[PDB]
């Protein structure tokens, strides 16, 4: 069981780690792009790019499975201790609104990239069929090259110290005191 990730994408994960732990930057919750939009753009783009030999069925099946996996795996493998209270304030600000909060509508694709990175660990820790595993690997690589060709307009490198929208916000002093205290 081996999975490959392109080196630009691995650079995205390692500078995510740098911004979280060293540079003290957490993800911007009201981002203009949510993971549902990413998966919908994926599905329509790869449906309109190729022909229709029957791949749409398991395409939408993988899309829905990844949607509910990202719903049920947001805070169980992902989400460093710094953003746990971010998730907590999302849940209480939704509980005061009498609305069940889903991570799909508000979270960014960088956490999906984190889930893709730890996918080999979850796959090797479960008993699964061989053909389903190779199909999941093929769909993962297809999503990775789709992220490759749309790499410019999706992960825009911006400094949040001088811009309003940079898909990242900075840690405050009380944030540090309640997070790492």
């Amino acid at each position: 069981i081996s999975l490959q990730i392109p080196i630009k994408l691995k650079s995205v994960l390692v500078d995510d780690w740098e911004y979280v732990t060293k540079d003290k930057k957490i993800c911007r919750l009201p981002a203009d792009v949510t993971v549902e939009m990413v998966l919908n753009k994926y599905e329509h783009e790869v449906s309109q790019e190729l022909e229709s030999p029957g791949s749409q069925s398991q395409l939408s099946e993988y899309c829905a499975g990844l949607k509910l996996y990202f719903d049920k795996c947001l805070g169980n493998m992902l989400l460093y201790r710094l953003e746990r209270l971010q998730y907590d304030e999302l849940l209480k600000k939704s509980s005061k609104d009498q609305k069940p909060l889903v991570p799909i509508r508000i979270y960014g694709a960088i956490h999906l990239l984190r889930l893709i990175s730890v996918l080999p660990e979850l796959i090797s820790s479960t008993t699964m069929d061989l053909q389903s595993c190779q199909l999941l690997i093929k769909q993962t690589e297809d999503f990775l090259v789709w992220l490759l060709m749309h790499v410019d307009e999706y992960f825009n490198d911006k400094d949040p110290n001088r811009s309003d929208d940079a898909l990242y916000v900075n840690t405050s002093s009380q944030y540090e005191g309640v997070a790492l205290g």
Partner: protein
């Protein structure tokens, strides 16, 4: 020349000792006042006592949750106080002591009472030694200061004055005031401290503010054991340049014994004369001046130099003789008003200071219940028996 100076003393400022084996101590104010009346300075100086502040009168800079926390500080139930302690940094590095609420209330009362007395025009120099806390943040207790009374004093001065300059001359400079006035153009913050493996670790040469507060916050780093002559060289030209260029209407003086020769976490090597002649030079301009005190790890030395600062502000020269007071056992073997400088190495080079001068000049050449608002209410305080 001759100027009326208001001294603000509270009988309960020292009644709240923070803890045992403890650097920060508000206890020095009581021997400061004892030396005030023991020197016979009350005949040419008026004394009033400031009232304690309320909940809403501390709300102009700090958050409501900070005020609620500082209202409900009790060390007895600290077991369950864990979300709010760390959020504002309390109990991890800065422990909890009883009677804090009255301490910060009288601190803010003295600070904005001095600001209001400066704004009204009753006195030329306002002295509030009971509160000089400068390290407190908007939602963080750091630098062992919980309420940054200097920020509310500055904005109360801005309620009447157009421009007011804040200065700090001791080590562990107050980053809270610089953070609070980082974007405004009508407020300028000056800092005289040291950098490099130090506790605050903030204040750079490139740190001059952003936005409308660009080039409106100067910060010069220093080194260990800077002597009196080099401190005069780093004080006087930048002071005359900042009076010529910025032209403030009021000056906030944060005197303290942290910049003296003897200190616990400090690194400076100035005596009483070096700490006082700079104040004399900045007072010779004749501009209204606010004096606050919130530093000093030693106790005898900071009490002695603050007594000398009051004596200088009274336009008299204090003798070296020390009379009898209830605090006479504190001082050293000589038992005189003499803060002896240490023999620290003067690593601070003249060329480094000169390069700092060129960078500072190049940065500064571009400058060219609320019912009780506005204060104006203090007790008379005409009968003290601190003389011995």
């Amino acid at each position: 020349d001759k100027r009326r100076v208001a001294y603000f003393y509270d009988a309960d400022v020292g009644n709240y000792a923070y803890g045992a084996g403890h650097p920060m101590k508000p206890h020095r104010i009581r021997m400061a006042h004892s030396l005030i009346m023991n020197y016979g300075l009350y005949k040419k100086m008026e004394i009033y006592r400031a009232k304690p502040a309320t909940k809403q009168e501390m709300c102009q800079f700090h958050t409501d949750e900070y005020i609620d926390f500082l209202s409900r500080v009790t060390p007895d139930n600290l077991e369950m106080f864990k979300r709010e302690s760390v959020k504002f940094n309390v109990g991890d590095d800065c422990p909890v002591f009883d009677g804090l609420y009255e301490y910060c209330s009288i601190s803010g009362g003295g600070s904005m009472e001095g600001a209001a007395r400066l704004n009204r025009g009753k006195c030329d120099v306002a002295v509030n030694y009971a509160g000089g806390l400068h390290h407190a943040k908007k939602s963080e207790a750091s630098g062992f200061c919980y309420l940054n009374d200097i920020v509310l004093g500055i904005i109360e001065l801005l309620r009447y004055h157009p421009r007011v300059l804040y200065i700090d001359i001791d080590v562990h400079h107050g980053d809270g005031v610089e953070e609070a006035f980082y974007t405004t153009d009508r407020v300028m913050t000056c800092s005289f401290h040291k950098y490099g493996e130090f506790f605050p670790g903030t204040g750079e040469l490139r740190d001059i503010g952003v936005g409308a507060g660009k080039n409106y916050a100067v910060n010069v780093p220093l080194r260990d054991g800077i002597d009196d002559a080099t401190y005069r060289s780093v004080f006087e030209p930048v002071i005359k340049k900042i009076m010529e260029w910025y032209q403030p209407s009021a000056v906030v003086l944060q005197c303290g014994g942290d910049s003296l020769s003897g200190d616990r976490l400090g690194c400076f090597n100035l005596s009483m004369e070096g700490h006082a002649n700079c104040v004399n030079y900045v007072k010779s301009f004749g501009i209204p001046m606010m004096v606050v005190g919130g530093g000093g790890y030693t106790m005898r030395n900071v009490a002695r130099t603050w007594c000398f600062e009051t004596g200088l502000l009274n336009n008299v020269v204090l003798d070296k003789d020390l009379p009898y007071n209830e605090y006479y056992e504190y001082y050293g073997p000589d038992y005189k008003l003499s803060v002896r400088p240490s023999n620290m190495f003067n690593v601070n080079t003249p060329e480094y200071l000169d390069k700092v001068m060129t960078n500072i000049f190049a940065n500064l050449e571009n400058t060219k219940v609320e019912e009780d608002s506005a204060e104006a209410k203090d007790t008379k305080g005409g009968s003290q028996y601190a003389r011995d």
